[PDB]
Amino acid sequence: NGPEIMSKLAGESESNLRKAFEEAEKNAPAIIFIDELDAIAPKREKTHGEVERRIVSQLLTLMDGLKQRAHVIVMAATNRPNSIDPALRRFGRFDREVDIGIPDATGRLEILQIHTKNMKLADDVDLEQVANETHGHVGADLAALCSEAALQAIRKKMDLIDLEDETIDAEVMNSLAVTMDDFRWALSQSNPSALRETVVEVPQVTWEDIGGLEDVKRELQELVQYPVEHPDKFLKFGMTPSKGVLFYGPPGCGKTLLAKAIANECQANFISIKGPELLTMWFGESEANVREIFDKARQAAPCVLFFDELDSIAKARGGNIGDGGGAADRVINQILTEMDGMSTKKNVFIIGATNRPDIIDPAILRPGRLDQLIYIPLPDEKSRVAILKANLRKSPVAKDVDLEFLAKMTNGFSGADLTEICQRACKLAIRESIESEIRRERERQTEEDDPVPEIRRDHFEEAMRFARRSVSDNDIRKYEMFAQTLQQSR
Amino acid sequence: KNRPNRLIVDEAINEDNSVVSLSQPKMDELQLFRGDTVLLKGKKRREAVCIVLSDDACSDEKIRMNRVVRNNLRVRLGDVISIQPCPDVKYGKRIHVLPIDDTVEGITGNLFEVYLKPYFLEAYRPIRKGDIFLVRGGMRAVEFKVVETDPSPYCIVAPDTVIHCEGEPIKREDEEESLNEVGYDDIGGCRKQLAQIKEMVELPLRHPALFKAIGVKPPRGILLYGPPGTGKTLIARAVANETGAFFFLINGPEIMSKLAGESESNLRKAFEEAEKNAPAIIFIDELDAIAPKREKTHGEVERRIVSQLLTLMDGLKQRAHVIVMAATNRPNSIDPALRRFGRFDREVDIGIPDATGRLEILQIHTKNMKLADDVDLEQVANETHGHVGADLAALCSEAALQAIRKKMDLIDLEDETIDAEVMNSLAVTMDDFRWALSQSNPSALRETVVEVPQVTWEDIGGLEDVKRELQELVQYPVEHPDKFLKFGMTPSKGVLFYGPPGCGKTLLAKAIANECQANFISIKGPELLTMWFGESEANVREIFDKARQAAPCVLFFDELDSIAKARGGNIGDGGGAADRVINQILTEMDGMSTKKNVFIIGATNRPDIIDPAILRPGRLDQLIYIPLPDEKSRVAILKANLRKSPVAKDVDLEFLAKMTNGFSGADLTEICQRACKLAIRESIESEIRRERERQTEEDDPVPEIRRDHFEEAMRFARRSVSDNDIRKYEMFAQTLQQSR
Ligand SMILES: Nc1ncnc2c1ncn2[C@@H]1O[C@H](COP(=O)(O)OP(=O)(O)O)[C@@H](O)[C@H]1O
Ligand SMILES: Nc1ncnc2c1ncn2[C@@H]1O[C@H](COP(=O)(O)OP(=O)(O)O)[C@@H](O)[C@H]1O
Ligand SMILES: Nc1ncnc2c1ncn2[C@@H]1O[C@H](COP(=O)(O)OP(=O)(O)O)[C@@H](O)[C@H]1O
To answer: In which residues is ATP 1 bound (chain A)?
Structure first.
């Protein structure tokens, strides 16, 4: 381990580093595990002392004295790959790199089952709730969560009931169940999640959730799945695959939803890069770390990179006019340079998105880059009904709700606004239920409990008064004006 | 004989060293009345005699007793005792008490007539042989042990029984501790922080054997941080003394002042010594001096010291009987290799006390000062905004030293040195505190304040629909989230108050933070402009981190459009939407824990120039328009602002409301304050006239603001808001669901 080597004197740290390798080579086959590698061998300029460089060189020459032996394997642990001396990450020394990374809902459920394996939980505790409510926790936090939950479940009772008794009884200790509220307490407070990192996983929205756009389904399925399934046809006909799409359209019609769905069906990871992230990299003026993202993509292949709000840099730089009025910027140039010079077949599929398709610089849709432009249209009646029922599919709804009349009534509304209508109708329903809870709580003396958990037509027909058209007519018109600049009428 | 006589000790609210407080169900169950002498048997065949009184905030197994009787019974807080009622003697014969040599040093004169004389007057208190009690006075606390009790073993106060006690200081027995040490009672403020530390170290330190019968890892790294001078070492000493664990103290400079090998040896010796005497606490204070940031280690020996501390902290996962607490100043000032799981995983923020906490600290330090009656500690506690515990300690010491330097030293002319009874006859004045608090005490605070505010719903005038909307948006979810789960709706975690300047946005947010009984972190407009101008927008994340260290909170990002309004407003710097700090606010808001009860509230005076990416769903999006107040609300505004000032009957608030229209509440408060200014000026003219009497009881300066002041200062009323302001506000309203 790193600190233990750096806590000794110079010659003695050299001797321990030598002794470890020779001892482990004596007892072949062996594994040597050096953890906290970035403490023992940091970056070159970060070695302010002299003894540090001698320790790094000693580790280097021992690692190069191991090409003779085939019975020793050396595994090391770091925090990020660009945090150690680049002389170590070369062929013959440290050539395989494995990224452990963050678990997901299934993985978090796995870890919680590991740590509560002998805890004697009650029946009401639902680990799925916890696993869905621990977004941003890694294994050590879940271990701390389980230990803290047990300690809460031993501090509030059955210690201050041990009054007649002096110490813990075995059978008493076994009779310790935990509640869902105990987990709600431990998970609510005192556990700061240790994650501000980008998440890479298989998403959970599927094709049944997006409403409509079935031609776009049979196009995305083609563009993503057709090549990677069976590339023999592409070889017989000699066509390179397209490694990009550019969704352009009005704001809030399901671009993110569509990309997450096509990442779901393909059963590949999904690295999302928001708009604020691009603005952060432009404002701090450190556009270098963009390459890191792509590197991360190649460490988690296959992926669907989703460069959402790709025009945000342009729209923040005066939009049409401002700063001379050129085309390219820092981060978009770096995206071009990283996209062009990447491995032509890894199943890494870059997907853009934009709300203003004209202000994006024309050098991005030249062939060999993301070029297969797809216009996401404003949803219509047969798709509006699907949108509405898919969003209501998680909420109770009665029979008198006329989704046909709802569709016919609302036109030129984006799906985001319809979801706003649904959620605000549910908000009014929630408010009505809390008024019913206060009335039936304020009983005459203070089993007719049912708060009517069914959202009646009144809520929808009242919250429909708060429906607002987020999209004008000239929006659709300039979108058609961009459409005619494509193969439709030109 | 087990059931009625077992309860657990806890903290006290009363200050008398003889009263024990029990809840009402137990005292009617136990068949006990007020005043009854009762007896407590504890550990190690020890006894305690006590008068009992009634209290409210307890359960049916909790007993509240002060530290003196708690140490008299040889038990500690959180343990169990046995409680039996006895019959009363209702007299005494000849008691005898002795002083302790450890407490009495440099006391001249006799201790009897000055201390024991006023103590047993009209307060019937029972005592037992062999106890230890404490008396406060003359800026000291003196211990007294009862040696001989003539009529019974336990005898109540009885003024016929004089005290014959003229003896030498008796040697304090070496197994028992003094009561001038530190305990939970000797820490003012920090109720929540003591709650967290007391629940964190109850089981490993009180019940060590329990953690040999289960595989469960208790937390072993605790990191205390807060401003310097907030008494962090004091908390550790307290917790050590109250759990009875061994306390070792390492400090930063002392380790860095030795040679290399010897600093390594002391750091090793401390851990092995404290591990020998389990259960123990190791307290390393000034952690940021012994283990700073990586790039800030210019030497080589520093890195060896940090690595030695690291490998000792990782050699402690085997042992469960050692806890390591450290103290720093801010969490991002130490090596990030320490703030990881297994080494320093729990972090506690002490922080600044508030008015109640400052009152607590001032009561702690003036506990034996013999103040006069006119001094009002509430005035001081309201007038010490920006002081932490060390400054209040310096304030009390400086006030006492002022109250001993201007008189009764230069009256000691015939006398040579200080007399005991003379020293006891030292009262302090409110003016003395005004002097000490006015000058020579630079407050050591430029930090953001986090606390529960003090304005309430009765102060804002009008806007009752906005009350029943904010109550919904803030309180509805956190009260009972079951309904939201049945209907599957995510809570809204934001509001955006938009409206004219000075109609009570800050007041409204502070009120909704008050009723919810949550902290309130305010982020002004100048702060955003500072972070944009210095171009260090990174530390915005720190603010949010602070929010999650003080949860629940109400972040109030006041003047959210100030960055835009300083960047040319409508036109300037190309003319985009987003800026640095607002982007950083989006990135920190989106990627935060979706349920912590951290509620972000914006505010703005120009709702159109704010960039449209902030009110997209999943962020602050529930826009609320704060309207210009009307008649029924103007009267409420006016009476609420006048509610702290004397006002007569002839003031026509109805005519005042009808007369002033299109005026924002800020301007009406300006009218009120300027009317009071004219009233003050008139009163000073009356004071000069009646001071310039004919020879130089008709004193009354007429402390009643007549109608003349209001009707004259009403000539200086100015409309801060035009008509086109209200019109473009309605133009923003029609861009919402009203008419679109
Ligand atoms: N076809 C659709 N099916 C289901 N939900 C949709 C659909 N279109 C939009 N939504 C709603 O819109 C939101 C996604 O908006 P999105 O398209 O990501 O915005 P943007 O275009 O700014 O990226 C989701 O909350 C979702 O509820
Ligand atoms: N909450 C508090 N209650 C009582 N005293 C306090 C409190 N906060 C600070 N003080 C006082 O301020 C001082 C804090 O300084 P510090 O350096 O922590 O003390 P120490 O001398 O123990 O290292 C102590 O003298 C303590 O009496
Ligand atoms: N409804 C109200 N009730 C009581 N006081 C108010 C009210 N509205 C405004 N005030 C006065 O206005 C001031 C607060 O102004 P504020 O709304 O914070 O300004 P801004 O809108 O620039 O943030 C306070 O001094 C308060 O006296």
So the answer is: 79, 115
